[PDB]
């Protein structure tokens, strides 16, 4: 009544209009497909960080990726989607208008080429990838119940505001003119600086794997690193290629850029390791470099000329390779790989987007931007820096607050203090904890949960 | 001559008309993509059931998934497609009109938005997923030749009739008004009750892994469980999302429901295990719960409001969790996991579809239904029960008949009787069977086929 | 100025026209999706050949697949794309017009239904699959630096010319009328005969695994074989299905053919092994047969009637099964599996395409061909043979030249001579090479690179 297209609410009355008429069906099919591709990046992250670990994590990140997929999907449905994409938000956050996905259907989303329900599906996958990045960063000696509560809270008060600033209809970064093609800020810079908060507050200090004369690379499982990298690169075609919101050739241009940045990042990191080790070929390095390039090109993929995409592989690979060395300086391992690749890689990529963004690339699908230094738009670099600094500051500060607030509550403490924690070898001698004898997650039906030595 | 569109046979003469003009190209692209996604669910099933096993299966289900993909594709081509989708069937079964895919081309399929050849591709994947569910259920001490013959026969006389009733142009369940969005009946309820027939006739009784004080969860490979769950959830976006037959936003709505049911099922099953174990976190349970939710939402995904999808995770997870305990009561392990997840999960999901189906959800793409209890259509619940009971009865009874008929034929007996079966350790002492020494499927070039101790 | 559609260069001025208007958006979405599917075939190849190996390769092919993805993407960007698809080539090769992808944007590609940038993305994946086939063939005792240089050179002077002849606007095989639906020549026949050059020049002679009374199948990792086969079959829907360049039902017809050829190839090879071993069931054989069928149907998938696709499984499976036996005759293992499956399978499939190609199948999307023997076009078989012989001759001869030229240059020698190579067990006793003690690529951060025993 009339139930005709309004652009608001459900978008119209399904008994009176065909809501699908508002959209190009091929745009919808590509974004649906891209959503499925981003989903498989979730276990990709878990495999990557499980495999790279220089320490025996009690919690399997391959499995924790499924836990994160579950917690993030629930959070997104409950209020995460609404806090980012409620068509009625301020400049800093959305509302609870779409609590439990109420009225999320056929109105054109903030990306007008797809309906709200499909944009919900697609963007929810980005929240889930960020959730497993966070769980991976904070996995060492994590308690599962508190971790699940942490992820729910963290998505709500760290991810959702940063996502709103970046993608929301009235988000202040959107208004300012900052560029972030595929959500490098909300996903990579954000998780990376939240990881750093974890490292500096909850991470083990004077860590034996980061102390003195120790190997920079000492992986738990190279096959897991490689499988994770495979799922990440495969899924990243949806992550970046879908960020146009359409079936135009800007989507395919972004995929060409994505592939070339990954390729040049992998080769660059491996070449850097070759020079720095005096001629060794680094198995872990090739994979880390591909990830550095993928992260680097994320804010840029639909904005920069193809030939510049090689720079988004080379420069993040070099800078991230050296950022990893800060683990030796601080003597901290926990959380630091996620910071180095996603935090530093995300910052570098975001900065370089201000240099290389071009109006003629965005215009491939009619997207209008002033451009970067390629168009003599010098001020763009300042907009990029404003975004990167705001994301880093909010993520680091608020993540610190959550971690410490939960730490002060006995039943919510994410990681027990070392002096209250019982040894797995001692638990295994007790009848009611005999299952701690199987310290191998391949055969154990139960998570080897940290137990307080007061029971 | 005139070779113009007829809606029958090949659909028209390719030299005179463009058969593609009858279809929206984006509808076709989504269903082609969804077909590829369902294909990877085949090894997903094999990985899941290989990993969950409390017993050392001689046959690797990861590998058997490829065998099933081969047998099912051949059966479908030969006559399986025709027995379900020959446009000229009765109310109970199709015909051999499309034997060897004769004349399967460009006529609109029973799903009018895609041509016969594409519907053939898509629906063949559902047959193959059901084949590996059956092979998984019946894998313990299976002989490979007889298993392949069994799958061919089973697809023909169990899967194909149930699929016809559900999807066929004149299928009696279609006519009755029963709802089954993505083939929960033909795939999950069917394989589950066929699994139960296997359990009760060919399964080992008084099984040491299901007898007395034994662990409910004791997996062969947690990494295999997790990898299988990953492939299943990823592919299920095609399984459910493609069941609209189109590129409309009902496809994406169904994907949102699919993700939320998996997420809530995983969390629910793990929470149930936490209460029942006195505080342990169940690795296997999270995965089983995700599968329970995916199975649960299958008959419902394109029919129920988004907020109700959480019920399709919670309720099947709880009921299936307790159904697994029946293995202890019966002291039977073989085949029972497939029954618990797919049979019970499928029954529960089908029943709840009668409660929660809504005309306004179906109408998102113009699909007309009376609805469920959400629309005060009380009779819908009875239609659902008629379907579930018919599927369970046909599958259990006919599967029983096939298993027992083959059992009475020496060269077709699927599983040897324990007293006619030689020990692998004894075979390994014989020169012509020395390869039985390698009881590890990771390195052995040959299937460790059960051998009769009469040679 | 006018910047309107020209069909050349960038295709038009993005500030004046919408380049996307020239294309059906659904055609673009399918080819973008198919590109992502072909990408995952890259690690599929690496997993397959790592797993099948009868020898302990020091270089992990699962990991080397990522290296190949990187080298091939860079080569393709640099000049590979231009040498195949520069719209201004001769009959034998393209030009450097599109060096570093200059002006590769929105002009219709040689496949007029997609723009240059998307055809670039898609076809680059084929180059990368061929790169990992080559790296796999030549992996035994390979040195990594020289291997990377080799792949770059090989793509440039072996792959690119053969691809031009097959796909290029003025390619001589195109003009002749030879049929090759999905690039069986450039990918499979080519890599297979290049593998044979490797086998005969650099392969180990009188190899203990191929000498005397030794097992035909003795795999390193069955799980790797199966995982590789899964990724290959899944991705092959894009490899073959995308080779129409469009969203028509010829794409889906090609997928039905692809699935049926894989299925019948797997069953055929396993049945052949069953007869030849006196009743054993071959784990490796089922997988090899699926690959033989997939290779076989590649030149044919969009040209042959569905019922004939079973022949493209059966015949290549039988012939390739016996081709593998030539390893015993020659007493050479290295490189020979790639030759047997891709070289022989590719030759057989190409030949049979001349028998079974049908004008009415090509015409499903308006593609005009004279057809094969199915249309009494007898001369087609000669065109097929001209293509197969030219590919085999160029690949074998030029690959031989490259391998031998690099062999004569100390720092480019791909494989050290056995008498200049130090033992891993001896390197491990030296302090600066202690890491050679860990001969297990699952835990070692470094490639166990062959070292000259002159340092
Ligand atoms: C525990 C947290 C309970 C929060 C549930 C309240 O949601 C409400 O729902 C309305 C639409 O559903 C919104 O308009 C409104 O803003 C919001 O307050
Ligand atoms: C443990 C999981 C808890 C989440 C599931 C509860 C979702 C609450 C949403 O409320 C529902 O929203 C509809 C909007 O249309 C209303 O019409 C309906 O009356 C109301 O019931
Ligand atoms: C979706 C939320 C699931 C419940 C989250 C509640 C806060 C964390 C509860 O976990 C706690 O962890 C302890 C092990 O350290 C367990 O001994 C104990 O049983 C449990 O109190
Ligand atoms: C630390 C987070 C800072 C985010 C807000 C700063 C910019 C506010 C712009 O207002 C318009
Ligand atoms: C062994 C089984 C052999 C069955 C092959 C016979 O198929 C026949 O093919 C016709 C169209 O091809 C159909 O019209 C007809 O109904 C069917 O009988
Ligand atoms: C071991 C695999 C056996 C399956 C392969 C045999 C398929 C038999 C199909 O018959 C063919 O159907 C066409 C329909 O158009 C006829 O035109 C053609 O004359 C006829 O030959
Ligand atoms: C596609 C069908 C493939 C053949 C199926 C025929 C029925 C089963 C044959 O397998 C049998 O299994 C025995 C091991 O138990 C083997 O010793 C014996 O060789 C073989 O007689
Ligand atoms: C046990 C299978 C029962 C299926 C047939 C029962 C319903 C027949 C409806 O006819 C109309
Ligand atoms: C090291 C190899 C350096 C080769 C780079 C030269 O590329 C040139 O670029 C032009 C368009 O960019 C082409 O028209 C021209 O043919 C080509 O010669
Ligand atoms: C180690 C990786 C080396 C590859 C990266 C160098 C790519 C060289 C391409 O040249 C660039 O091509 C543009 C075409 O538009 C010109 O406009 C621009 O002026 C020019 O700079
Ligand atoms: C993208 C190209 C990367 C460099 C390729 C240059 C040619 C091969 C160089 O590798 C060589 O391999 C030796 C081990 O055999 C190493 O000891 C030595 O450091 C190095 O000289
Ligand atoms: C050995 C490679 C042979 C390729 C060229 C031979 C055919 C040339 C056709 O000219 C037209």
Testing ligand 1's pocket by substitution, the residue of A77, A82, A89, A96 carrying the most ligand atoms inside 8 A of its CB is A96
> Which residues in chain B touch residue C281, judged by CB atoms under 8 angstroms apart?
144-145, 446-447, 449
A304 contacts A356 by C-beta, under 8 angstroms: yes
CB C273 within 8 A of CB C285: yes
Give the Cα separation of C31 and A252 in Å (integer).
Answer: 9
SS3 assignment, position C140: coil
**Element of type H or E holding A52:** helix A25-52
Closest Cα to residue C291, out of C223, C249, C340? C340
CB A264 within 8 A of CB C67: no
Rounded CA-CA distance B159/B155 in Å is 5
Rounded CA gap, A419 and C327, in Å?
A: 62
**Cα C396–chain centre separation:** 15
Give the integer Cα–Cα distance in Å for B98 and B115: 14
Q: What is the CA radius of gyration of chain B?
A: 22
CA–CA distance, B389 with B381 (Å, rounded to integer): 12
Closest among A407, A48, B76, B251 to C66, alpha carbons compared: A48
Which of chain B's residues have a Cβ under 8 Å away from the Cβ of C247? 25-26, 28-29, 32
Q: How far is the CA of C128 from the centre of ligand 8 (A)?
A: 54
Nearest to A156 by CA among A236, A84, A61: A84
Report which of A33, A292, A129 is spatially closest to residue C35, judged by C-alpha positions. A33
Ligand nearest to the CA of B79: 5
Q: Which of B60, B277, B230, B221 is nearest to A441 (CA)?
A: B221
Q: What spatial distance separates the first Cα and last Cα of chain C, rounded to whole Å?
A: 64
Calculate the alpha carbon distances from C104 to A306, C82, C90 in Å: 9, 9, 19
C-beta C77 within 6 A of ligand 9: no
Q: How far apart are CA A229 and CA A235, in angstroms?
A: 10
Nearest-angstrom CA–CA distance, C312 and C297: 5
Name residue B446's beta-bridge partners: C282
Give the CA distances from residue A162 to residues A90, A97, A180, in Å, rounded to whole numbers and listed in that order. Answer: 13, 19, 12
Q: How far apart are CA B13 and CA B4, in angstroms?
A: 7
* Ligand that lies nearest to the alpha carbon of residue A317, given by its number in the listed order: 10
Phi then psi for B415, rounded to 5 degrees?
Answer: -130, 125
Distance CA C236, CA C254 (A): 10
Rg of chain C, C-alpha, whole Å: 22
Q: Are C19 and C200 in contact (CB under 8 A)?
A: no
d(CA A425, CA A437): 7
Which stretches within A278-299 are classed as H helix? 283-297
Bridge partners for C446 per DSSP: A282
- B385, with CB counted inside 10 A (0-12, 13-18, 19+), is middle
Tokens of C243: 């080779």
Chain center to CA of A31: 19
Contact A237 C36 (CB under 8 A): yes
Phi (first) and psi of residue A442, to 5 degrees:
-70, -25
Asked whether A66 and B287 are in contact (CB, 8 A), the reply is: yes
Side-chain half-sphere of C92: how many Cα atoms within 13 Å?
4
A360 CA → ligand 4 middle, Å: 30
Which residues fall within 8 angstroms of residue B368, CB to CB, at 6 or more apart? B359, B362
Reported as type and span, the H/E element at residue A381 is helix A380-407
Residue in the block written with tokens 């109970």:
B92
**Gap between the Cα atoms of C71 and B291, Å rounded:** 39
Rounded-to-integer distance, Cα C198 and Cα A254, Å = 37
**Would you identify the CATH topology of the domain A1-455?**
Ammonium transporter fold (1.10.3430)
- Give me the DSSP letters along A112-176: TTSBHHHHHHHHHHHHHHHHHHHHHHT-TTB-HHHHHHHHHHHIIIIIHHHHHHHHSTT-HHHHH
* Nearest residue of chain B to residue C220 (CA atoms): B443
| DSSP letters for C298-335 | TTTTTTS-GGGHHHHHHHHHHHHHHHTTHHHHHT--TT
Structure tokens at C407: 């062999």
Q: Give the whole-angstrom CA distance, residue B341 versus residue B294.
A: 10
> What is the rounded CA–CA span in Å between residue A186 and residue A154?
12
Helices A61-75 and A116-137, axial angle in degrees (round to 10): 140
Handedness of CA B166, B172, B175, B177 (dihedral sign): negative
**CA dihedral sign of residues B142, B144, B146, B150:** positive
Are B70 and C230 in contact (CB < 8 Å)? no
**HSE (side-chain half, CA atoms, 13 Å) at B299:** 35
Domain ranges of chain B: 1-455
Q: Which two tokens stand for residue B221?
A: 């490979």
Q: Are B26 and A26 in contact (CB < 8 Å)?
A: yes
Tell the residue nearest (CA) to atom 11 of ligand 9.
C97
Neighbouring CB atoms inside 10 A of C205's CB total 12
What φ, ψ does residue A421 adopt, rounded to 5°? -100, 130
Tell the residue number behind the tokens 């075609």, with chain if given.
A237
The CA distance from A95 to the nearest CA of chain B, in Å, is 18
Residues 6+ apart with CB under 8 A from A205: A331, A332
Q: Which of B441, B346, B414 is nearest to B46 (CA)?
A: B441
Quick check: A263 and C70 CB within 8 A? yes
- What is the maximum span of chain C, computed from C-alpha positions, in angstroms? 75
Q: Which of A435, A406, A436 is nearest to A421 (CA)?
A: A436
CA angle C273, B99, B197 (to 5 degrees): 70
SS3 A445: coil
Residue-level length of chain B:
455
Q: How far apart are CA B390 and CA B386, in angstroms?
A: 6
Where would I find the beta strands (DSSP E) of A286-426? none
Secondary structure element (H or E) that encloses residue A233, with its range: helix A222-241
- Other beta carbons within 10 Å of B303: 28
Among residues B148, B8, B3, the alpha carbon closest in space to that of B73 is found at: B148
Query: Which of A100, A101, A148 for mutating ligand 2's site (highest number of atoms within 8 Å of CB)?
Result: A100
Q: What are phi and psi of A415, to 5 degrees?
A: -130, 125
Q: Is B446 in the pocket of ligand 7 (CB under 6 A)?
A: no
- Cα C72 from Cα C45, distance rounded (Å): 14
Distances (CA, A) of C54 to A125, B276, B361, C215: 42, 48, 56, 9
Q: Give Cα A154 to chain centroid, integer Å.
A: 13
CA angle C276/C282/C286 to nearest 5° reads 110
3-state secondary structure of A415: strand
CA distance linking residue B381 with residue A137, whole number of Å: 48
Q: Which of A252, A351, A257, A369 is nearest to A304 (CA)?
A: A257
Tell me the HSE value of C163 on the side-chain side, using a 13 A CA sphere: 27
User: Are residues C246 and C24 in contact, defined by beta-carbon separation less than 8 angstroms?
Assistant: yes
Residues contacting residue C144 through CB under 8 Å, at least 6 positions apart: A281, C59, C67, C447, C449
Under 8 Å between Cβ of A400 and A158 = no
Q: What is the DSSP letter of A245?
A: S
Neighboring chain B residues of A106 at a CB cutoff of 8 Å: 249, 364
Under DSSP, the state recorded for C138 is: T
- Chain C residues whose CB is inside 8 A of the A286 CB are 63, 66-67, 70
Q: Please state, in angstroms and rounded to a whole number, the distance separating the CA atoms of residues A97 and A75.
A: 15
Question: Please, is C25 exposed, middle or buried when counting C-beta atoms within 10 Å of its C-beta (0-12, 13-18, 19+)?
Answer: buried
A266, C70 in Cβ contact below 8 A? yes
C-alpha B7/C-alpha B403 separation (Å) is 40
DSSP code string of C412-436: T-SB--GGGBPPHHHHTTSGGGGGG
What's chain A's Rg over C-alpha atoms?
22
- Peptide bond just before B289 cis, omega within 30 deg: no
Q: Name the closest-CA residue to atom 5, ligand 8.
A: B390
Q: How many CB atoms lie within 10 A of CB B432?
A: 8
Q: Which of A297, A350, A344 is nearest to A318 (CA)?
A: A344
Which neighbouring-strand residues pair with A452?
Answer: A421
Instruction: Show the 3-state SS of chain B.
Output: CCCCCCCCCCCCCCCCCCHHHHCCHHHHHHHHHHHHHHHHHHHHHHHHHHHHCCCCCCCCHHHHHHHHHHHHHHHHHHHHHHHHHCCCCCCCCCCCCCHHHCCCCCCECCCCCCEHHHHHHHHHHHHHHHHHHHHHHCCCCECHHHHHHHHHHHHHHHHHHHHHHHHCCCCHHHHHCCCCCCCHHHHHHHHHHHHHHHHHHCCCCCCCCCCCCCCCCCCCCHHHHHHHHHHHHHHHHHHHHHHHCCCCHHHHHHHHHHHHHHHHHHHHHHHHHHHHHCCCCEHHHHHHHHHHHHHHHCCCCCCCCHHHHHHHHHHHHHHHHHHCCHHHHHCCCCCHHHHHHHHHHHHHHHHHHHHHCCHHHHHHHCCCCCCCHHHCCCCHHHHHHHHHHHHHHHHHHHHHHHHHHHHCCCCCCCECCHHHECCHHHHCCCHHHHHHHCCCCCCCCECCCCCECCC
CB within 8 A of C213, min separation 6: which ones? none
Q: What is the 3-state secondary structure (H, E, C) of C377-399?
A: CCCHHHHHHHHHHHHHHHHHHHH
Of A193, A183, A174, give the one whose Cα is nearest residue A302: A183
Ligand that lies nearest to the alpha carbon of residue A356, given by its number in the listed order: 10
Smallest Cβ–Cβ distance between B101 and the set C29, C247, C307 belongs to: C307
Answer left, alpha or beta for residue C396, where phi above 0 means left and psi between -120 and 50 means alpha: alpha
Tokens of B353: 């579809």
d(CA C280, CA A89): 68
- Residue closest via CA to ligand 11's atom 21 equals C411
Residue C118 has a CB neighbour count (10 Å cut-off) of 29
- Contact assessment for residue B26 and residue A29, using Cβ atoms and an 8 Å cutoff: yes
Distance A163 CA to ligand 3 centre (A): 29
């Amino acid at each position: 009544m009339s139930g005709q297209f309004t652009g608001t609410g459900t978008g119209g009355d399904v008994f009176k209009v065909d809501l699908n008429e508002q959209f190009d069906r091929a745009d919808m099919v590509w974004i649906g497909t891209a959503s499925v591709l981003v989903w498989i990046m979730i276990p990709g992250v878990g495999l990557l960080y499980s495999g790279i670990s220089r320490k025996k994590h009690a919690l399997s990140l391959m499995w924790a990726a499924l836990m994160a997929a579950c917690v993030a999907a629930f959070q997104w449905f409950w209020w995460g989607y609404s806090l980012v994409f409620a068509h009625n938000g301020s400049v800093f956050l959305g509302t609870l208008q779409n609590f439990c996905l109420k009225d999320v259907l056929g109105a054109p989303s903030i990306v007008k080429t797809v309906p709200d329900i499909l944009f919900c599906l697609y963007q929810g996958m980005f929240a889930a990838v960020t959730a497993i990045l966070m769980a991976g960063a904070g996995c060492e000696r994590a308690r599962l119940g508190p971790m699940m509560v942490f992820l729910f809270i963290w998505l709500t008060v760290v991810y959702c505001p940063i996502a709103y600033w970046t993608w929301g209809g009235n988000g202040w970064l959107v208004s300012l003119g900052a560029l972030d093609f595929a959500g490098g800020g909300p996903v990579h810079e954000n998780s990376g600086f939240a990881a750093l908060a974890y490292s500096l507050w909850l991470g083990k200090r004077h860590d034996p794997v980061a102390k003195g004369k120790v190997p920079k690379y000492k992986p738990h499982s190279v096959s897991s690193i490689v499988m994770g990298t495979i799922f990440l690169w495969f899924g990243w075609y949806g992550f970046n290629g879908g960020s146009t919101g359409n079936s135009s050739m800007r989507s395919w241009y972004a995929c060409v850029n994505t592939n070339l940045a990954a390729a040049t990042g992998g080769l660059t990191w491996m070449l850097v390791d070759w020079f720095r080790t005096g001629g060794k070929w680094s198995t872990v390095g090739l994979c880390m470099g591909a990830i550095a390039g993928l992260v680097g090109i994320t804010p840029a993929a639909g904005y920069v000329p193809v030939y510049t995409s090689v720079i988004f592989g080379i420069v993040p690979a070099i800078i991230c390779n050296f950022a990893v060395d800060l683990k030796d300086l601080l003597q901290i391992d926990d959380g630091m790989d996620v910071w180095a690749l996603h935090g530093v890689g995300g910052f570098v990529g975001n900065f370089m987007t201000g240099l290389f963004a071009a109006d003629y690339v965005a215009m491939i699908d009619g997207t209008e931007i002033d451009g970067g230094w390629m168009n003599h738009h010098w001020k763009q670099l300042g907009y990029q820096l404003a975004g990167s600094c705001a994301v880093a500051a909010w993520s680091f500060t608020v993540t610190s607050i959550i971690l410490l607030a939960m730490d002060r509550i006995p039943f919510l403490r994410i990681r027990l203090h070392e002096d209250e924690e019982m040894l797995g070898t001692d638990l295994a001698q007790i009848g009611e904890y005999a299952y701690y004898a199987d310290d191998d997650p391949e055969t154990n039906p139960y998570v080897l949960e940290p137990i307080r030595s007061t029971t």
